[PDB]
Structure formats: structure tokens, C-alpha cells
Design a protein around this ligand. Structure first.
Ligand SMILES: Nc1ncnc2c1ncn2[C@@H]1O[C@H](COP(=O)(O)OP(=O)(O)OP(=O)(O)O)[C@@H](O)[C@H]1O
Ligand SMILES: Nc1ncnc2c1ncn2[C@@H]1O[C@H](COP(=O)(O)OP(=O)(O)OP(=O)(O)O)[C@@H](O)[C@H]1O
Ligand SMILES: Nc1ncnc2c1ncn2[C@@H]1O[C@H](COP(=O)(O)OP(=O)(O)OP(=O)(O)O)[C@@H](O)[C@H]1O
Ligand SMILES: Nc1ncnc2c1ncn2[C@@H]1O[C@H](COP(=O)(O)O)[C@@H](O)[C@H]1O
Ligand SMILES: [Cl-]
Ligand SMILES: [Cl-]
Ligand SMILES: [Cl-]
Ligand SMILES: [Cl-]
Ligand SMILES: [Cl-]
Ligand SMILES: [Cl-]
Ligand SMILES: [Cl-]
Lengths: 417, 423, 423, 417
């Protein structure tokens, strides 16, 4: 019987086991033998077939029959990448031929899919067929607008529940939380958690008009929201910050971000966006009775058990991968569009300028973004022109109306309105 | 004086009602509007007594609604009181709305609530009052573009999956079959969604039956064949999900057997009381007569009322926030006798009459599309005997032996089921 | 060779079974022991065929058990297969245990499982095998020091609270009464725990009835009085929790009415089949006849099987970890024919005889102490008519008027209820 | 009718609303009038009766009938403390007399109870034990309300991190907020099966050294690595910081002078224990294939909806507070022992050396602690004396057995065994 081998690459997202089980169960009904490589390409890169065998398992019915309930991945994952070296690509081809892998399914992000196609491009199309399922919790695949990537619904819903606890705690014991949503690629996750939880502010890189963000502008955007709520008798709230703000900051802004220090270098992971903003804002607003606390939301989302939407999603994706194998497809990506799972050739999704799959960002001109903005607390252009409002907010910050306009009014040209 | 927006809920609750109330109220308050909420739908507006109505209306202020987007249920309650049947009741509602000076009238409910709102508007000046309705249903049976959900459906399906998960662990830990009955007779979206997400071994919905009337025997044998096939592979346990809509598709003879070979109950006016039917219980009793000797135990379990007021999941929180906003936007844009729906990520008003099926006069009901690829995929991961399976003699011999019967007896009893449901 | 520890589960699952298996296995593996798990309790050990037993036994290795403490259910399954009835079955078990060289034998189950393990041990030499059982019950009916819980009870009570919460929101959003029936006929701990935690408006357990046999009419009137008192305060909705144990205290006459004025169903041996009773459904029908004119809707709802394999809450995870460790410690100290329980924060072995009530021959049943302060506090927050309430003429006039009857008719019908339940 | 006034003090814990509703509902059945002071003692401390009145609300049936389902506190809370100044103590008594409060119920931890008695020594005062840290001096094995809820949610968060650390091999250093005791850290760790837990109670010496904490985590990571596991989860009570010596704190803050408030006390809130340990350990172990990530668990626990144990607990506590008022008790704390709620005089709970409420810590000599320790990965004394094991772990750390013993063996005198 033909051999299907499956591996996972990149950082996990809820529903990985759903894809493994959808593909495995269907393949077993077809009579296929299914094996799973542990930790992605890590051991296939060595080329030693004995080492690979020690880190491959038989994906049987009993193993996968109920993993659709479970977050994580039973075959683990790694960022080991064979595409960088032609020796590594040939080591992967050597082990795949030794195991008689007829069908090769990878579940991972762009780097994982590119590794799978590079292994196939130097391999006979009759002995091996390669299919990849695009993975990302960030919702940044170029699907039709409003259609989600798998795992995003689970991450957003758990993020809403965590922020709910922080909303009740900030009101019960007046304080501001600056929640930092991990993920620098796009603002879908930060804005989704914020809108669902009714957070009082959300800042994503997509809403900044200029190409480079300044540290001062971010501080003042949060400062204005705190003062406006304070003018309405509320010295507490929650502000959600997409970590992608850091990757859009200028060189000078990053210098201030790291404590007026030289930014580390080989390193945006060492940055503490929420922490730095909390310190600066306490300098400016602590005298007003405002306390501010940072809080990161990230790793606890990646392996939460999938919600029903993602369970159905990944079951259909696993099926579609096997169907693509049956219909002779190769070097294709299994995506779901308009309720239909279908294979799409890797190059059809690539952005020519980058060489990787195109990144779908938050559309800040859409009506959905304007609706989310409506339920946030913030000073719009019209608000700065409302003199009664400006007088109350300035007085809340213990400053003259002219000083408030002098400091904050320019922010209407920093972010879309 | 600021314009008055009045809000009410009609029909059975669904997760996210408070999200629609809060989206409309918060945005309206930023516009300077005064917002009031009628308690229990049309119940008190139908009396015509303005004193009674005011005793059951409340001021929807910022503090009241500022955080109800986290909460299931509806803070202004709901009712199935329906003024559309009587012009006296329709005029009583108009009388109280004029007394309260309602400029904008938002109803949140199902089909009957929207039809009541439009009937109240047709005898009302479009300049004094504007009426908008937001369609509600956990059953996912609104005619939205295919595969796009109605609000509340995601929450109900996800909680249904988690309950069935516990029943899947229990059925395997202590081998047994659960016959889960998903409440709701309108369509099979909810039953099939819970079943596919939870990996249930079978799902039966009215949509998959080819004939216009289902027979009680056919339903019993469809579950029986699944139990026997599982038993042939060494598994004397499982979970089968049943849409309650199977009952409303059954023939007269089938309903007689369903109610215990007794006369089906009827209301004073002469309507069969299908709520008193216990589909999962009756099927469990019959199947225990046939399969108990094989070591099979079967237990029914209903999933229904515990879903209606669960706290909304994030998808429904975003959904209902956008719907509440879209209702206020529709009022601002001069729309009336319209329904706020979301299509391809865009909330927009759609005239009530544009959504009516001309042959019926009511809104068209979207059922599960059993020809779609989604249904075919869900069916793949169920345990069942397909057309191809009945022609496989090796498999048929294994299943027949599991049921302690000859292969010829197995084909005689179960093979006809391929003409009962689409394949 | 390393000593062999064999583990099995019997009876119905409870949250934390996997915690006991993993606590015992991990500690034993650090001692160098070999650990095996029998699938489905005594089911296959009863055959006596060593090949069949091996086909349904697995090696409990570190990898198998390292993370099952998060999971409800039992990875080695369970059954009520019971060798205590036959020494042919007991000797079939003894033959397979000797063949597998089981030095230590841990069973996790109820009375039937522990009694089976000791009967198998009494006909073996104390040098070749040592037997320890861990008592299991989700009902909280072990004779531990008062208010100290059995493992699994916290998980079941907490999930029951969450289900009832959704029903409390739904009953208020769409005015109606739910009659929630907490499955389990042994005691009232589970029903009372869910009700008090959820703030349910009434809870009825068999323990609070003074007489030895309950009458169907009295139960109907106790719920009726609560509904009428709530109605007198403007509340035509609520939730009432009923322990299924009420059925097992009902008289022959009460059971006749319960089953529809029919002869109660019976098994082949002539014993009554109380599982076929639908307590919540029957009370809902009767109460709708009496109160439907008042605008009251009543709906039954069962809570049972979805609790048994929910993932354990932290209290039960720590609990079952300590029990599994304590079982290995008991083996190390030479104990046998002992039960591993936790008392006053200390896991200890307790000889079978200390827990047996001579009248039953099985472990003593700890019921709810209706004289305790905890029960009196729970009763305070319920809606009900106390002795003093019946003496309050103003209150009786409001409640009777709520039921559309005279104060004398209300007192004549309901006042006797003060002698039916403890006050 | 008699007036019952209720307030909450300290950081929120799940079940606060349960106490308010238990006391209020029962008091309303007695015909009492119930009021709630917003934000604890904050406004009572001012002495301005006008300000206090603006921040009190009427606790009616409709307000409290269903708040037992809700985390947080509807009357908010604060750490405002009148015991520090006798002028403030007289301000609190002045406002209570002005409002004619006959019964005064405070809901909080040790700091709140000690504040209530200073007002009481010169109206009836009762306090209800609140703390997610479980550090009130209740009878042994009896939890404070909120502890069950916080421990159970912490277990669920750590579960997601356990699946993620195994799916994508890495170590998480979870920092459990709370410096008073180790009940919360040990509870979350034992329930979740975390591979290590470090609490201040297990250190023998009065002052902890930064190097020893690093090496205790290092030894666990190396022992796991010797058994084929390059991943895990370690839970750390942040109270380790409050036991560190002056030198340890210097290294903790980046070899800088520890930050300080105007009075000269160290600002331990600004410390990042988990991050600092993660940086040091990655320098030492990154070459072995070890990744390490810090993660804080704290503020998201404080206002989770109460679990059933805490709902029943706080209902009985609220009832017991009213019963104590009816029976003439004052200056007492409502505790539950053997299923019986009873008042216990404040002075019986004071530690004679301190004059403040006694703090109950984890008993590291108990059998419960020894059992939790059994399921942790660590090197005991006997392990360091096991020559075969020491050689396996040292080889895992790429060092000689002699180098391993020289570095780690002294740790048996650092923590209890
Ligand atoms: N930035 C904001 N985000 C959300 N709600 C707001 C915001 N600003 C005000 N609100 C809400 O608007 C409602 C109406 O407020 P108000 O009567 O002061 O006039 P407004 O039209 O909102 O003011 P302005 O146009 O100056 O922002 C209040 O309930 C307030 O909570
Ligand atoms: N109805 C079903 N639903 C889901 N999985 C099934 C079903 N029937 C069989 N399977 C699974 O399909 C896999 C293959 O089964 P099996 O060996 O019987 O099929 P086969 O190789 O096609 O042979 P045969 O033609 O004899 O059926 C097994 O793991 C079985 O569990
Ligand atoms: N520190 C530890 N904490 C928990 N389990 C452990 C620890 N060290 C080893 N184990 C587990 O102990 C089991 C037995 O391992 P092994 O045979 O090496 O003996 P050991 O437990 O180290 O004891 P001994 O010192 O008596 O040889 C293995 O499954 C291993 O996972
Ligand atoms: N049986 C009961 N259980 C709980 N609360 C009650 C009960 N009876 C009355 N109450 C409440 O007690 C308060 C005083 O009632 P009354 O003395 O009748 O005005 C009101 O808030 C009532 O709603
Ligand atoms: Cl990663
Ligand atoms: Cl994180
Ligand atoms: Cl309804
Ligand atoms: Cl309906
Ligand atoms: Cl069972
Ligand atoms: Cl605080
Ligand atoms: Cl302790």
C-alpha cells in the first residue's frame, strides 16, 4: 500500500491534530500506510535513515481517532529548514526514498511549505507527490476577506476570555492593563480579541499612515484614551497592543523602546513593548491616580483545544489533502475558499516581491475596522474640534485646553480616522 | 428633545442578544439618543395600556449595557407575544409606541418578530417612526449566502461539541452508545455541526432522507446498522447525534409508533404536540430490544436549553456588535421595514419583502445542503454502511456475524436503506 | 525480575480515575516496578483464558501515563463485570493473575469492585499477592469525616453549577421554570451542591423527608408552593433541583402515579426498574395542569452522564495524585485487603471492616446531614414556605392570591407540608 | 432599621460577590438596610463625609440576587489603609458614625482585617477571609475563599503551556504572582504536573542567593535532558524575590542598584524573576538545544468567576457574618471549620511578635509537600550520591562528573529535602 508521511513545521496552532487526523483517518480507509515524522524536518535533515526511523511513528487508527479534541501536535514540530542547503534537501530526499513515501504532507507556515516544494523540485514527480497545508494563527493568509485561517478562531476566543478577566479586574481594582498580543505579522489577532472583549483601545501597525512609527506617538495615543475616560469618571481600562507595532518602529524609536539603550543585535523578541509604555505613562499620569500594568498574551493560545469552528475546519483540510493526492496534485497548498477546500499551486499564492506567500493584513479602510473603532475610547478629529470636550479632557489631565491641543491634536495625522 | 430608540426581543433566546442590544445602545448614546427597552417583547405593548407598558419598560443607559456583551441571555427578556394576528393588537402597539414617542424601533427576534414589526409599521407614518429588525436564530436557517452563519449558532455549536466530548469519553471509558438529541426542529445545521466537530460516529438529519415522510423503522435501522458495523470492528460503544427535526418529517404511522403505539397528543385546537415526543428515548428502547443481547447498552441524552443563553464566543461577540451598529446606521440612513444581516463581511439592511418567498409569504428557510462537499466530508468520517459497503461481501459477513445473523438476513433487513437517505 | 503492579477500574467512571492510575504508576516506575493495566475491569480476567487477558492488557509505561492527569475518563476503561458471584470466575481471575505474576493488585471502583478484589485475594497466599482498592464515588457518599469530599465530586458539582447557570439565565430571559433532575439515587450531596452553588430557588433531596416513604402529591405541592411564592413576588420563573433519589423513597402508590398510573416496569427477576422513571417530566406535566392558567411554563432537564468524564478540576487532580501515591505506599508497608482513603488531609489505608455497615455488608452510605449548619444555610437561600410563613396571614394572602385561591384554601392544602420535610 | 455597611479591601479574589450577596440577601430578609462603600477604605480614610457619601450605593435585592456567579466585586476594592495613622483611624470612625452604620463588614485578607480592628478598638466589626494566596491563619487544611478558583484556572493555563512546551520543545518559567507564601504556586504546579516548583518556604537559609535559584532550575533541566526530555514547565513563586539577599537583588535587577520608593524600600514589583532566570539559563544551556521563555500568571486569576467550591464557601461566609452580628460578636473573623462557620476573635489570630495577623505559609514538613516533591524532576541528596545518575546528568550537561558535583551538590543544603 502507498505510504503517506506527515510532519509539522513552525510554531503550533490549535487544530494541527485535526489536520493530522483528517488526513490519516481518510487515508487509512483507502488502505494507505501512514507514518509521522517527529519534530518536522529536524531528523530528516541528517540523512541518517537509522536516526529518522528512531523519530518516526506509525499513525494508526487508534493513535489519531480522538486527537481532534486536542491542541498541540502529537508528532511535535520544529523550525528545522532544509531549503537553505542543497545537501540538506538531498538528505531529506534520501530518507523519503528509503521509506518509500509516495505522498508527503507538511503542515506548517511559509518556510515549511517552501521546504516541501524544494525537496520535490529535485525529485521525480512519479515517485513522490508533495502537498502542504498553510498554517498560521495570525489570520494573515490571502483568503477572501473575512475568511479565517485555522486556529485563529480558537486563539481569538481564548484571548477574549483572558481579557474579560482583566476587564473585570481593572474595574474592580481601578487600573489600566496594557495587553500585548504576541505576533508581529499582522493585527488580526490583537483587533479580534479587543473587539470581542470590548477593550477600550486597540493599536495595530496597519492603522499608522507613515511608514515608520515613533515611540512618542504610541505613548500619546494611549495617553489620550486614558485621559478621555478619566474625564468621564473612569480611571481604569484595558488597551490591547499588537506586537507588530515594534517591527514598524524607526531606529530612533527602538532606541527609546529598549530604555534609551542600544537595541540588542544578533532582536525584536527581547523588546518589552507593553512594559516600556507602562513606565513612560506612569511618569506622565501617575500623579493623576492612574496605575498601569503590562500583560502579555501569547504562548497560552497556541495549543488550546480547538473550538468547534476549527475542528470542522481542520477535518475538511485533512480530507482535502488526501483528495489532492488522489487527483494527482503536487506542489500545492490545501486552502478553503468560500466553503470549498481545494488545492492551489504554491506559486499562485506567492508575492513576487518577497518570494513567500503574500501576507493579508488588517484592512483599516473596511467598515469592520471603523465599527471596532466606534466602540473604542479615543479622540477623533471632530473631538479635538469640540471645545467643551477638549476642556474636560485637558482638565482631567490638569493642563490647559491649549496645552492639550498642542500635545495631542497632531495625532489625527498619525493614524487613519 | 432627543430622538427615542426603543428595543425589544422576541422569540427564544440565542447567545449574543445582549451584544446586539449593547451595540445599538452604545452607538445611539454617542449620538445623543434616548434609549428604552421593552421588557418581554411585545407582551405588554399588545395590551394597549400605556401604564402597563411603562411599568415594564426601562431606560437603557451606558452603565446598564456597558458590559453585557460578555453575557448570554437578554437583559430586557423576551416573549413570543404576536400582535400580527389581530389588528386590535397591532393598533395597541402603535398606540403605546406613539405615547412613548419612539422615533426608532428595533426588534431582535426570529421570523414572527420581524413580521410583527413590519405589520406595526405599515399603519404608521414613515416620518414619525422607522422600524428595523435583526434576525436571530441558533438554528442557522436564515437564507444568508451558503456556509455563512447566523449569530448565536457558533456559541451553540461549540458548547454542544464540548458536552458531546464528555459523552464520547464516557461512552468509550464505560462502553455504551449515547443517542444525543439536538433540540430544534427547523433544520439540521446544529446537529450536523456538533456531530462533525465532536467526531460523533453518526448524525441523522431530516435533510438527508430522500422520501418526503420518514418511517420510524427506517430511523431505527439506520442507527442499528451503525452499531453493528462498529461492533464488527471490536467497538461496542459510540455516540449518535439526532436532529429533532426528524420528528417533524415523520409520517402519521411513524408518529403513532413514536408516542408508544398510542394516539399522538394534540393541543385544544388540534395540533400534534411534538414537544411531548422523546425521539432519543423511543429509539433507545427499540434498539435495546434488538441489540441488548449482544452486550450493547443505549442511553438517550438531550442537548437544548443549556445552549440558548451560554455566554457568546468571540465570533458571536464580534458578530452582534456589528449588527447592533448596523441597526443604528440603518436608522440614520432612512431605512425602514428592513432586516440587518451580514453578507460577505458587510453588515447592510435588506428590505423584509425582498427576503420573502413569493409562494409562501414567509422568509425562506435555508436547510443543510446535502449535495455540498461539506456534507460529503462529514459523512466520510461517520461509521455507516454505504452503497459500496453493502456490495462488499467480506464486510457484510463481518457485520452480520456481529449481529448474530446470516449474511443473507443482513442484506434483507438493511440493504434497502440505500434508498432511504442520499449517499 | 521487578515486581508487577496490575491496575483496573470497575463501575461507572468519575473524574480523576486517570489521576489515580498515573499517581500510582509514576511512583511505582521510580521504584523499578513493572505496571500493567487490565482493560474493562474484571471483564476479561473472568474468562480465565490467559491469551484473551493478554490481548486486553497493556503496559502502563511512563509515556502512557505522564499526562493523563489532565484527562477525564479512564484510559484502561471500566466495566461492572463482577467475579464475586462465582468462584469459577474468581479462580479464572486467580489463574490469570498468577500467570502474569501480579505481586501488587490495585482496583479503583465501588463496593462491587473492592469486594471482588478481596474475594480473589482470600483464596491466594498473602506472600504472592497484595490487594488494595481505592473507593470511588461521584455521589460523595463515602463515610469520610463530614464535609470532606470523595474524589470526582468537586468536578461534577462545578460542572453542574455551570449548566444550571445557563438554565438560570434562560429561565429569567424567557420566563419559565426548569425542573433539573440530578441523576444519582444514592444521596443528595450532588443535587444540593449544584443547587446551592448556582443559587437555585429550590432543592429537594430524599434526606429532608421525615417519613420513610414519600408521596407523589407532597413532592408536587412542595414545588407548587415555591412557584406560587415566587409568583407572589413578581417572579414567574425559576429553577428547582431534584435529587433522583426521591424516586427510591417513594411508596408503592407514589410510584404508580409516577409511571403514569401504570404498574411500575419490572425486570425479569421482578424488581422495579426505577431507571425508566422520569421524575422531572412527570412533575412538569402535573404542575402544568395546575399552574398553566397562572402563566407558568415548566420544563424538565436531566444532568448526569455529562459529568462523569469531565476533565478533573485542580482539587480532584491533587486529590487523585495523593491517592495513587498512597496506594503504592500501602503496598510498600505490607498492607492488603485495605481501602485507600483520604481523611483529615492524610491518605491512609483503612481495613475493609472499619468501613462496612453490618446491615448492608457493603460500605456504609453517608447521606446529607439535614441537621447540620450547612444544610440550614442552603435552605435559607431557597424560596419556600416555612412554618412561620404559613402563620403569616399577610404572606399567605399574597401567595394564595398568586395561585388564584382563597387564603383558607391555600392553608388547607399546603400547611401540612411542614410535617413532610424537616424545618 | 439597622444599617449594615460592607466594603472590600486588598486585591480581588473570586467569590467577593458571593460574600456580599450572602450577607446582603440574608440581611434583607431580616429587614436591615444594606449599603456598600466603593473602593474599600479609600474614601472613609479622607474623613470628608461628603466624599464618602458620593461613593456609597444601596445594596438591594435586585443588585445582589445573581452576583454569586460573577468574579470581581461590584463595590470595587482598594488597599487604602487607615491603621498606619491614628488621624486616619479617627476619620474612618467619624464617617461610620455619620452614616449610622450599626454593623460593619470588611471583606479582605490580613492587611484588611488588621485595618478593621484599629477602627474597632474604640458599631460592630466583622471580617471575612479573602485571599487567592491562601495565607490567612485558618485551621490547617482549610482554604481561604478564592484559592480554589485561582488554582484551578492556573492549572488550565499551565496545561496549555504543557502541551505547547512538548509540541514545540521549550521550557516555560511560569512566575506565580504573590510574594506572601507558596500555596498558589505549589497548588498550580502539583495539579498541572509541572516538572518543578520553587517556593520560598523550602529554602533553609534566611536569605536566598541568585546563583542558587539559577542552579536549582538548571539541575532540573539537565536531569530531564538526561532522560531524553529537552522541555518542561517550572513554576516559581514570586515570593522568592522577597527572600533574596542584597547581593541577589543586585544581580536580579541587571547588576544595577535595586529601584526604591521615596522611603528607601526596594520596589520588588519592578523585578522580573522569570525573565532574569530565563536569560541566564539560555546563556548556559542554549547550546544543548534548550529554549527558555518566561510567563507570568497572576492578574487574570483574581476576578475569574468563582468555582462551585468558592460559591458554596462564600455563601456560608456571608451568612455567618450576619449570624455573628445577631449574636453580639465583634472584632471577629468569620472562619469555617469542620463544616461549621464560626466567629474567631481577632486577638487569637495575632502573632505576638508582630501585632499583625499571622501569616500561614506552606508546611514543607507535611506529607502533602513531600508527595508533590516526589512527582517533580530534581536532584535529591541520594541522587547526588548515585554515581551512575550523576554521570548521566553531567554528560547531558556536557561536563565531567567532578564539575557537576562541584557546582550543584551544595544545593542539598540550600533547600529542604
Ligand atoms: N470615545 C468614546 N468611546 C465610546 N463611548 C464614548 C466615547 N466618548 C463618549 N462616549 C459615550 O458617549 C455617550 C454620550 O456622551 P456625551 O453626552 O458626553 O456626548 P458624546 O456625543 O458622546 O460626546 P463627544 O462627541 O464630545 O465625544 C456617553 O455615554 C459616553 O459614555
Ligand atoms: N464507516 C467507517 N467510518 C470510519 N472509519 C471506518 C469505517 N469503516 C472502516 N473504517 C476504518 O477504515 C480503516 C480501514 O478498514 P478496513 O481494513 O476494513 O478497510 P479496507 O482495507 O478497505 O478493506 P475491506 O475492503 O475488507 O473493507 C480501518 O481503520 C477502519 O477503522
Ligand atoms: N526526578 C524525577 N522525577 C520524576 N520521575 C523521575 C525522576 N527521575 C526519574 N524519573 C522516572 O523514574 C522512572 C524510572 O527511572 P530509573 O530506572 O532511571 O530510576 P530512578 O527513578 O531514577 O530511581 P533509582 O534512583 O532508584 O534508580 C523513569 O520513568 C523516569 O521517568
Ligand atoms: N423564601 C425566600 N428566600 C429568599 N429570599 C426571600 C424569601 N422570601 C422573601 N425573600 C426576600 O426577602 C426580602 C424581604 O421580604 P419581605 O419581608 O417579604 O419584604 C425581599 O427581598 C424578598 O424578596
Ligand atoms: Cl516555536
Ligand atoms: Cl506569552
Ligand atoms: Cl422560549
Ligand atoms: Cl420556534
Ligand atoms: Cl456505567
Ligand atoms: Cl491591587
Ligand atoms: Cl501546607
Amino acid at each position: 500500500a502507498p505510504v503517506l508521511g506527515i510532519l509539522c513545521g513552525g510554531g503550533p496552532a490549535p487544530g494541527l491534530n485535526g489536520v493530522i487526523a483528517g488526513a490519516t483517518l481518510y487515508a487509512l480507509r483507502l488502505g494507505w500506510k501512514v507514518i509521522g515524522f517527529m519534530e518536522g524536518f529536524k531528523y530528516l535533515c541528517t540523512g541518517d535513515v537509522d536516526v529518522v526511523k528512531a523519530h518516526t511513528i506509525d499513525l494508526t487508527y487508534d493513535i489519531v481517532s480522538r486527537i481532534h479534541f486536542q491542541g498541540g501536535t502529537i508528532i511535535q514540530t520544529s523550525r528545522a529548514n532544509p531549503r537553505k542547503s542543497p545537501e540538506l534537501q538531498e538528505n531529506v530526499r534520501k530518507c523519503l526514498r528509503a521509506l518509500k513515501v509516495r505522498y508527503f504532507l507538511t503542515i506548517g507556515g511559509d518556510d515549511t511549505a517552501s521546504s516541501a516544494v524544494s525537496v520535490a523540485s529535485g525529485m521525480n514527480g512519479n515517485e513522490i507527490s508533495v502537498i502542504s497545508c498553510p498554517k498560521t494563527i495570525d489570520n494573515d493568509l490571502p483568503l477572501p476577506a473575512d475568511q479565517s485561517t485555522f486556529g485563529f478562531h480558537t486563539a481569538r476566543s481564548l484571548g477574549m476570555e483572558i481579557i474579560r478577566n482583566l476587564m473585570v479586574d481593572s474595574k474592580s481594582a481601578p487600573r489600566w492593563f496594557l495587553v500585548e498580543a504576541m505576533g508581529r505579522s499582522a493585527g488580526h489577532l490583537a483587533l479580534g480579541m479587543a473587539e470581542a472583549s470590548g477593550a477600550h483601545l486597540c493599536l495595530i501597525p496597519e492603522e499608522f499612515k507613515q511608514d515608520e512609527i515613533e515611540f512618542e506617538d504610541v505613548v500619546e495615543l494611549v495617553e489620550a484614551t486614558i485621559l478621555k475616560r478619566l474625564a468621564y469618571g473612569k480611571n481604569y481600562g484595558v488597551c490591547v497592543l499588537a506586537e507588530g507595532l515594534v517591527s514598524k518602529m524607526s531606529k530612533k524609536a527602538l532606541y527609546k523602546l529598549f530604555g534609551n539603550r542600544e537595541p540588542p543585535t544578533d532582536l525584536l523578541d527581547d523588546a518589552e513593548l507593553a512594559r516600556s509604555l507602562s513606565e513612560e505613562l506612569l511618569k506622565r499620569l501617575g500623579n493623576l491616580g492612574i496605575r498601569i500594568t503590562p500583560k502579555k498574551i501569547g504562548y497560552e493560545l497556541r495549543c488550546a483545544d480547538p473550538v468547534a469552528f476549527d475542528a470542522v475546519y481542520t477535518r475538511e483540510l485533512g480530507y482535502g489533502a488526501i483528495d489532492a493526492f488522489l487527483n494527482g496534485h503536487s506542489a500545492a497548498l490545501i486552502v478553503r475558499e468560500n466553503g470549498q477546500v481545494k488545492p492551489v499551486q504554491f506559486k499562485d499564492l506567492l508575492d513576487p516581491a518577497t518570494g513567500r506567500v503574500r501576507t493579508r493584513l488588517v484592512d483599516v479602510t473596511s467598515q469592520s475596522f471603523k465599527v471596532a473603532r466606534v466602540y473604542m475610547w479615543r479622540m477623533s478629529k471632530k473631538d479635538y474640534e469640540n471645545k467643551d470636550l477638549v476642556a474636560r479632557v485637558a482638565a482631567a489631565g490638569k493642563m490647559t485646553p491649549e496645552a492639550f491641543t498642542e500635545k495631542f491634536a497632531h495625532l489625527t495625522d498619525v493614524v487613519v480616522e
